């Protein structure tokens, strides 16, 4: 698949929903057609003005045409996704989904991401992720929900486009979804106070990513203590599940490194944070800020060691002592693939 092939498809595509799409709309208990058309028009206002603000006042018409290409991709993918959903379930039960403003804004944002990232590769101001989130007032967690389904729905995406969207997904899973403005925390609260298939799906994705990164660092650092990986995973996993407030405005990898460091302390194995941190920077998309600038309290930032000592341990001291206990907790299963 090539950039040109996809862009030819979009340039030939209709600006309006297809007859098939309209049939899906008309079959809903609550007809979403007018909402959908009006939302596309309204967001066009916002997009073309913010595009011109970002790139220059003379670029309004260019922004308008790029928006049109995004809308065309949005309709293409929406129809594909609905065809898939109908096939898999053997029924159309689309009213709640199709009348969800957040579904449409996420799907439209993802389509626009493909467009923005493609133009931003070549020429310039970079309008790649997360620019579109801010333009659309869309939260990362909501955007996340459509990514895998979007990729499946558009067979004409390039390998590069797919890799970029997967990178976006990883960025959301590691930090953006855990910012204090993220709907994630209300979903967690709802589940903790009382169920959510979306919450379970997200966590299982986070667990895989978390484990794969943990496994890498453990291979490099703790190869002569092979039993530690599973134990550190257990702490890591239980922290994500039960002490999720430690993730608020923080990064999956900070919890990862602190879990490693803490278990080693209680198991009487050396492992200086300097050693952890030096290995960490060798991870594919690792950045130094992640251990140099960690949220402590309010809006005070300090090093990862300061976070471990004043926040992490403060919360998990009793839980870690159990790992050097006569009866440790049952070890958490390793995530599948």
């Amino acid at each position: 698949n090539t950039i040109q092939q996809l862009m030819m498809i979009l340039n030939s595509a209709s600006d309006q929903p297809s007859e098939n799409l309209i049939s899906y709309f008309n079959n809903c208990t609550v007809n979403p057609k007018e909402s959908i058309l009006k939302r596309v028009k309204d967001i066009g206002y916002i997009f073309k003005e913010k595009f011109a603000k970002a790139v220059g006042q003379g670029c309004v018409e260019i922004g308008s045409q790029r928006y049109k290409l995004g809308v065309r991709l949005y309709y293409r993918v929406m129809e594909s996704m609905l065809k898939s959903e109908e096939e898999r379930l053997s029924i159309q039960n689309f009213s709640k989904l199709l009348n969800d403003n957040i579904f449409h804004m996420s799907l439209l944002a993802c389509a626009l991401e493909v467009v923005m990232a493609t133009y931003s590769r070549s020429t310039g101001t970079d309008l790649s992720f997360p620019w579109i989130l801010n333009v659309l007032n869309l939260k990362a967690f909501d955007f996340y929900k459509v990514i895998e389904s979007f990729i499946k729905a558009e067979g004409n995406l390039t390998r590069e486009m797919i890799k970029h969207l997967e990178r976006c997904e990883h960025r959301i899973m590691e930090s953006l979804a855990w910012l204090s403005d993220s709907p994630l925390f209300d979903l967690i609260k709802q589940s903790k106070d009382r169920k959510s298939t979306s919450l379970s799906l997200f966590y299982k994705k986070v667990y895989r990513l978390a484990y794969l990164r943990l496994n890498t660092l453990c291979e490099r650092l703790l190869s002569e203590h092979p039993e530690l990986e599973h134990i550190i995973w257990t702490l890591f996993q239980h922290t994500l599940q039960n002490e999720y407030e430690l993730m608020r405005d923080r990064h999956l990898d900070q919890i990862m490194m602190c879990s490693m460091y803490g278990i080693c302390k209680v198991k009487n194995i050396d492992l200086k944070f300097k050693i952890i941190v030096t290995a960490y920077k060798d991870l594919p998309h690792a950045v130094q800020e992640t251990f140099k600038r960690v949220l402590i309290k309010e809006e005070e930032y300090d090093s990862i060691i300061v976070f471990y000592n004043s926040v992490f341990m403060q919360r998990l001291k009793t839980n870690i002592l159990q790992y050097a206990s006569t009866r440790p907790p049952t070890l958490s299963p390793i995530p599948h693939i």
């Binding site: 996704m81 959903e85 898999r88 379930l89 039960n93 709640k96 989904l97 969800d100 579904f103 929900k145 459509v146 895998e148 389904s149 499946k152 959510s196 298939t197 979306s198 799906l201």
Partner: peptide
């Protein structure tokens, strides 16, 4: 890849 019903708690 999960169903949209799963992704949206429907």
């Amino acid at each position: 890849p999960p169903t949209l019903h799963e992704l949206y708690d429907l």
